[PDB]
Amino acid sequence: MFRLTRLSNKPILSPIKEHEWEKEAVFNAAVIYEGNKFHLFYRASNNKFVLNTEKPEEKYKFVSSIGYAVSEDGINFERFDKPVLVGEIPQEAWGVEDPRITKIDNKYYMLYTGFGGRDWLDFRICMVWSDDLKNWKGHRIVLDEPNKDAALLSEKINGKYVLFHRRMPDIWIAYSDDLVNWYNHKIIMSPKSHTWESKKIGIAGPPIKREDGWLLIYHGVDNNNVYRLGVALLDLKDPSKVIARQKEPILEPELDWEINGLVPNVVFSCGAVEVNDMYYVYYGAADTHIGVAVIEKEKVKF
Amino acid sequence: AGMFRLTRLSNKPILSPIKEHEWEKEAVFNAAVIYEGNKFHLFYRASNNKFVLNTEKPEEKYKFVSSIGYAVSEDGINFERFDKPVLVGEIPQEAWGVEDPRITKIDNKYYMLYTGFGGRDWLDFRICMVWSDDLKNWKGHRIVLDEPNKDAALLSEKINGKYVLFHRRMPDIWIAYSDDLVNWYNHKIIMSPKSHTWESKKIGIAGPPIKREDGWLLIYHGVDNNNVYRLGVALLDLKDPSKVIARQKEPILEPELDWEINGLVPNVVFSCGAVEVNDMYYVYYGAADTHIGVAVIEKEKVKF
Amino acid sequence: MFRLTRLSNKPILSPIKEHEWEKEAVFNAAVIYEGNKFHLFYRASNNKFVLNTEKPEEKYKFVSSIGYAVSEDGINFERFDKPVLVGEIPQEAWGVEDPRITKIDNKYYMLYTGFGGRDWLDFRICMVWSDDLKNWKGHRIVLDEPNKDAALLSEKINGKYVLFHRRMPDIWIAYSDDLVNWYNHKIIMSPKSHTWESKKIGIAGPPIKREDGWLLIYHGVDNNNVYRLGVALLDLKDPSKVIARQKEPILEPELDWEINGLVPNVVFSCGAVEVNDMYYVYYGAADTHIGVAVIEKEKVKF
Amino acid sequence: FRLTRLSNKPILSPIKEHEWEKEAVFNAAVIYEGNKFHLFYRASNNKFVLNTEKPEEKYKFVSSIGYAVSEDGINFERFDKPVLVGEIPQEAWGVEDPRITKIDNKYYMLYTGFGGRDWLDFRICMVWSDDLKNWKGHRIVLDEPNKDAALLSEKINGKYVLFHRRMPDIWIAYSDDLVNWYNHKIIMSPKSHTWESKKIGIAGPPIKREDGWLLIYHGVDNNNVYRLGVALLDLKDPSKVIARQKEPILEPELDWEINGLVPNVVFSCGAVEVNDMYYVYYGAADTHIGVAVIEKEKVKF
Ligand SMILES: OC[C@@H]1O[C@@H](O[C@@H]2[C@H](O)[C@H](O)[C@H](O)O[C@H]2CO)[C@@H](O)[C@@H](O)[C@@H]1O
Ligand SMILES: OC[C@@H]1O[C@@H](O[C@@H]2[C@H](O)[C@H](O)[C@H](O)O[C@H]2CO)[C@@H](O)[C@@H](O)[C@@H]1O
Ligand SMILES: OC[C@@H]1O[C@@H](O[C@@H]2[C@H](O)[C@H](O)[C@H](O)O[C@H]2CO)[C@@H](O)[C@@H](O)[C@@H]1O
Ligand SMILES: OC[C@@H]1O[C@@H](O[C@@H]2[C@H](O)[C@H](O)[C@H](O)O[C@H]2CO)[C@@H](O)[C@@H](O)[C@@H]1O
Ligand SMILES: [Zn+2]
Ligand SMILES: [Zn+2]
Ligand SMILES: [Zn+2]
Ligand SMILES: [Zn+2]
Ligand SMILES: [Zn+2]
Ligand SMILES: [Zn+2]
Ligand SMILES: [Zn+2]
Ligand SMILES: [Zn+2]
Ligand SMILES: [Zn+2]
Ligand SMILES: [Zn+2]
Ligand SMILES: [Zn+2]
Ligand SMILES: [Zn+2]
Ligand SMILES: [Zn+2]
Ligand SMILES: [Zn+2]
Ligand SMILES: [Zn+2]
Ligand SMILES: [Zn+2]
Ligand SMILES: [Zn+2]
């Protein structure tokens, strides 16, 4: 069994008080390694998160945006003044959350949760795409249902686009010919009772291709809503089949900025990249900061 | 294999929703059919909305309402339709509407069995029944069984002076008998799903059984572990329709076309009605809970 | 990868309409093999089982009794005119259910469900014992709580008596110094979501000792309340640890009198014995009849 | 280090003649005043069916708080009737696990009020007295399923300090006024794959030392065994744990700690410094009260 190792005992990205769109939280970041650079697309909030009201209240409204950051080394990032993605009004009035970015044939697809704030089920999987990581277009609701924790596979299977999603509480898979209409829905992995992953699970970042399968980092939620990261392996030719699944988490809230924050007891990844035989896993910490942790590819054994 | 299958009559739906009609804005599907007066009489389920089914409870913000529409055809392919549904859910006992009608003619009366859905929880459904003399003036509504239950049809004649009801306490096809079309007794399971097959999660009757010389033709739907709906066939003993004397292993219809694979509920073919015309079985089927198609098989090809 | 084979396509015991106490059902039978004879202690009902009322109602009252039958060949049994155990009033006023009998040293312990009918939770694990399978005494409430599916291990572990029980929906284990007071409660086995054993599980008969561990036949209930038998293997020295568990059931309702009956879709075993290098598994069918199915001991492989 | 029991027998046990303490006496708060041990103990009229989907009227148990006094800390005098019972519907199933803290010249008793309507229908409640006899001013401390609550015996920077237990951690919070709590944070967490893996909660109120605040706590393992552990809080900032012992200081060992209404439980709501010793009173199997001690000089991390 193997574990992620943190590159820092401090966040690598933290809120910026003088930018309203990110003055309270930066977390749950997609990442893509291209042009020998880490391109990070992070969720950012203008406010703390009041989640225990009967409905989302205007007086506690938070708005998520997607910011951009770039790094040579994966640790030190240059950041920018304005977010690169904001929500459309009114269906995404409370913003755009938890992006997962997948490259498929020289196009970049960002899958995110659009949240309208009209009730606590007013969220859905949305998708935009670009050819340059810069000019995002083609917005669509991927599944018109309350759903999230979505990612595209980086290649087609038998000609079909492959979507991971999360009808509560399982990781689901589905297929598409046109990136519009989805079919062959199937549960692929389920929570495990009396474990750290008992309440619900969901995909982390998009799966990483290996020789032995697709690496599926995921998050598991226990009975007290603690988020941890786990890891499984999907079959290479049929990624709807799980062929291995580690019992122990690979990352858990441990540092004080992972245990305490806007949402306590959370580590959460929307993105991970392979650079020089190392997996770099970017993670939100307590829905407040961003950390990064790694594992050598050789140590990934099932 | 040495099996038989339906042949689609057309590669496009024979009925589609109409966006300008609220009551059939998103879906027309799961249709009852009666051949009378040399006309196909089709009674289709229609929905005003998509089907969000993954919530823990039915949510009013995702409410869908099913109505039952009427369409009529001479060739079984091209249908005339109408502005308004012929049956709606009475509010609030059938607040989310009336679903999947099955129509059976017995002694010059027509009996429409449908699922009434109140939407108060996911078990808030029941078999209801209305009847008519003329396929036009439905009346006599009743709850057939006071229990969560659906996939119900009456047999077209009595057996030893008893009415025969097919129903579906999850996950099996059940039979039951009545003297008065009000009280049912001697409930028995007659057919069950088969593990590790296309019909593993649950089964239910399709349309009402069709009388043959060799028995009762029982088209049914089977649901696999991923909730794909396919159609199968079995044969019931002519004198005792509680006994299955044959059952084909492989389905006779399954999602193939894009408008059967993709739709409001992906991967569904579902029949509520099939009729014998000029020694062919015309099987009308909902497709992805969105459109209606028709498939056929020559009566002589039904061999087990 | 292994399954039971029915010895008969008809019940070996059925209700006796002339006997009020066993007029509607005989099922869920404990089994002891002694004196070259099969001893069956079967649940018997005077009535069908209406269960869908807010509370247990006198007009739907059913009474469970425990009858006895004995067989040399395992198929033809000698039966008796009256039951050998009936419920004490008021705590067992609706009778005594699903006995499991374990021989520990030279005493036989029968654990059964006493059902008082005062509420749907008005049931508990009770125990009586005998040295001769004839004179039962020493009645006690094993756990003073709603609980069932109980059996004693046939020997002590580290000087402790071992109890298997079923706080919903798991198979539990507990230990005792004195067969009165129980401690070290532990979940040992849980349902598995999206399978035939998703809703709940419970022990079948008392576990059978093998060289490679304890054979733990159990029942699993799916989302449609279908009851099937499965099989696991517990560690020989620490039976609280499961070392193997077959994925597929070993017995499922298939025959008309297993699928149809007072409670549809049930096969349920309260006893299994080893006879001539074969396991004999007696089972209730549709809570109405008793069947028997076997497996050659050499075919029990995980 | 570890605690040492003073008796291999309970020092308090249920009295079947008294309905309110018919089945159990356990989880007792204590303070030392007037050179007397004042013990405030939870008491139940019934066994504890916990495995139902919701709490059932047919299996209802009612906790009361009783009073007992001792001079040696071992032999206690007891009384016919409880001192606190549930008055209102939020306390329909009674009042549980009191922790008493003296701040300025007043005594505050924080306890769990349990309404029995569902298994989350429990709240941290508080009453207070001048005299340990007349409790007043009942309030819900936090309007949320929470328990294992205690007040610090002093203010920090003029703020009252509350320890609580949003599952599964020990939390701290601050109040200007004992009404509104803010700056909630997690100060200590379970350790997975150990005796304290499933959840932890404060025991009695922390005891002031010169090296910090002594934080006895209970840990719960994967099989629901309750044991006691000990940690040390920074003296000036009790949100900071500066030491924590790996192994328990008390676990079920005697037969009336292993066996009982809730097996495999030792649990303390109360401990006091008396003659250079910590006296740790504990419930055992949620059925009896025992007491164990440690020489304060022996407390080393
Ligand atoms: O998309 C909105 C989203 O909701 C939150 O997720 C969960 C949800 O609101 C509910 O409260 C559930 O029981 O717990 C929350 C997570 O465990 C967060 O993901 C939040 O950041 C988002 O706005
Ligand atoms: O009668 C309501 C009915 O429910 C749906 O049926 C199924 C049910 O909701 C459950 O979710 C099952 O597992 O999946 C659905 C179909 O498999 C639909 O039939 C729906 O159209 C109806 O309103
Ligand atoms: O001990 C009474 C016992 O109850 C039944 O078990 C279950 C129970 O009544 C409840 O309805 C639950 O939801 O499902 C039942 C079985 O799945 C039977 O075991 C019955 O025969 C017994 O009297
Ligand atoms: O305040 C009610 C309280 O509940 C019990 O606590 C726990 C709870 O019911 C739940 O079942 C948990 O998993 O285990 C119980 C103890 O670990 C007891 O503390 C009980 O005495 C109280 O009444
Ligand atoms: Zn700026
Ligand atoms: Zn959107
Ligand atoms: Zn699931
Ligand atoms: Zn998630
Ligand atoms: Zn772990
Ligand atoms: Zn029109
Ligand atoms: Zn109706
Ligand atoms: Zn059906
Ligand atoms: Zn095909
Ligand atoms: Zn007789
Ligand atoms: Zn009893
Ligand atoms: Zn469980
Ligand atoms: Zn059971
Ligand atoms: Zn299977
Ligand atoms: Zn007295
Ligand atoms: Zn209160
Ligand atoms: Zn606690």
Quick one: B292 exposed, middle or buried, by C-beta within 10 A (0-12, 13-18, 19+)? Answer: buried
CB B189 within 8 A of CB B172: yes
Domains and CATH numbers, chain B: 7-301 (2.115.10.20)
Burial A56-88 (b: 16+ CB within 10 A, else e): beeeeebbbbbbbbebeebeebebeeebbbebe
Minimum CA–CA partner of D188 in chain A:
A259
Structure tokens at D62: 């009612």
Pairing of strands A161-165, C267-275: unpaired
Quick one: C177 exposed, middle or buried, by C-beta within 10 A (0-12, 13-18, 19+)? Answer: middle
CB D108 within 8 A of CB D126: yes
Cα–Cα distance measured from residue C47 to residue C44, given in angstroms and rounded to the nearest whole number:
9
Contact assignment for B266 to A168 by CB distance below 8 Å: no
Cα–Cα distance measured from residue B29 to residue B294, given in angstroms and rounded to the nearest whole number:
11
Residues of C in contact with B170 (CB under 8 A): 224
Structure tokens at C230: 């499965």
Report in angstroms the alpha-carbon separations of A77 from A12, A46, A132: 8, 21, 19
Minimum CA–CA partner of D48 in chain C:
C145
Cα–Cα distance measured from residue C210 to residue B284, given in angstroms and rounded to the nearest whole number:
58
Residues of B in contact with C260 (CB under 8 A): 188-189
Cα–Cα distance measured from residue C188 to residue C234, given in angstroms and rounded to the nearest whole number:
9
Structure tokens at D263: 């097996």
Region of residue B242 (phi > 0: left; psi between -120 and 50: alpha; otherwise: beta): alpha
Consecutive H or E run containing D33: strand D24-33
Structure tokens at C161: 């008596």
**Helix, strand, coil content of chain D in percent (nearest 5):** 5, 45, 50
Cα–Cα distance measured from residue D2 to residue D4, given in angstroms and rounded to the nearest whole number:
7
Minimum CA–CA partner of B202 in chain C:
C224
Q: Is the dihedral of CA C84, C88, C89, C94 positive or negative?
A: negative
**Helix, strand, coil content of chain C in percent (nearest 5):** 5, 50, 50
Of A121, A168, A181, the CB nearest to B262: A181
Of D52, D56, D223, the CB nearest to C185: D223
Contact assignment for A145 to B262 by CB distance below 8 Å: no
| C84 SS3 class | coil
Task: Please enumerate residues of A whose Cβ is less than 8 A from a Cβ of C.
Answer: 170, 187, 190-191, 193-194
Cα–Cα distance measured from residue D82 to residue B274, given in angstroms and rounded to the nearest whole number:
75
Contact assignment for C259 to B195 by CB distance below 8 Å: no
CB D219 within 8 A of CB D227: yes
Mutate to test the pocket of ligand 1, among A27, A45, A51, A118 (most ligand atoms within 8 A of CB): A51
The distance between the two most distant Cα atoms of chain A, rounded to a whole number of Å, is: 51
Task: Please enumerate residues of D whose Cβ is less than 8 A from a Cβ of A.
Answer: 167-169, 185-186, 189, 192, 222
Cα–Cα distance measured from residue B42 to residue D254, given in angstroms and rounded to the nearest whole number:
78
**Cα angle for residues D228, D231, D233 (degrees, 5° grid):** 145
Structure tokens at C274: 């080893």
Of D47, D50, D58, the CB nearest to C119: D58
Quick one: C41 exposed, middle or buried, by C-beta within 10 A (0-12, 13-18, 19+)? Answer: buried
Cα–Cα distance measured from residue B276 to residue B33, given in angstroms and rounded to the nearest whole number:
10
Method: X-ray
Residues of B in contact with A177 (CB under 8 A): 258
Contact assignment for B170 to C224 by CB distance below 8 Å: yes
Q: Say yes or no: CB of residue C49 within 6 Å of ligand 3.
A: yes
Nearest CA to ligand 2 atom 15: B53
**Residue of A144, A185, A190 to mutate, testing the B interface (most B Cβ within 10 Å of its Cβ):** A185
Residues of A in contact with B59 (CB under 8 A): 121
User: Per the omega criterion (within 30 degrees of 0), is the bond before D168 cis?
Assistant: yes
Residues of B in contact with C258 (CB under 8 A): none
Consecutive H or E run containing C256: helix C256-259
B22 secondary structure, DSSP code: G
Structure tokens at B229: 């709906």
Structure tokens at B63: 């409410």
Q: Say yes or no: CB of residue C120 within 6 Å of ligand 3.
A: yes
Residues of D in contact with A252 (CB under 8 A): 192
Distance of residue C2 Cα from the nearest chain D Cα, in angstroms: 32
Cα–Cα distance measured from residue B149 to residue D34, given in angstroms and rounded to the nearest whole number:
72
Pairing of strands C5-6, A64-71: unpaired
Report in angstroms the alpha-carbon separations of C34 from C154, C269, D99: 14, 19, 59
Which ligand 3 atom sits closest to the C-alpha of C287?
21
Ion ligand 20: protein residues whose beta carbon lies under 5 Å: D 91, 113, 125
Q: First and final CA of chain B: distance in angstroms?
A: 11
Of C170, C187, C194, the CB nearest to A190: C194
Q: Say yes or no: CB of residue B51 within 6 Å of ligand 2.
A: yes
**Residue of A192, A193, A255, A259 to mutate, testing the D interface (most D Cβ within 10 Å of its Cβ):** A259
Of A223, A252, A259, the CB nearest to D186: A259
Q: Which residues contact B47 (CB under 8 A, 6 or more apart)?
A: B17, B24, B25, B26, B27, B28, B29, B64, B65, B66, B67, B97, B264, B289
Q: What is the DSSP string of chain A?
A: ----EES-SS-SB---TT-GGGSSEEEEEEEEEETTEEEEEEEEESS-----SSS--GGG---EEEEEEEESSSSSEEE-SS-SB-PPTTTTTTBEEEEEEEEETTEEEEEEEEE--SSTT-EEEEEEEESSSSS-EEEEEEESSS----EE-SS-BTTBEEEEE-STTSEEEEEESSSS-EEEEEEEE---TTSTT-SEEEE-SPPEE-SSSEEEEEEEE-TT--EEEEEEEE-SS-TTSEEEE-SS-SB---SHHHHSSSSSSBEEEEEEEEETTEEEEEEEETTTEEEEEEEEGGG---
Which among A18, A21, A70, A75 is positioned nearest to A46, based on CA atoms?
Answer: A21
Which ligand 3 atom sits closest to the C-alpha of C94?
23
Cα–Cα distance measured from residue C73 to residue C67, given in angstroms and rounded to the nearest whole number:
19
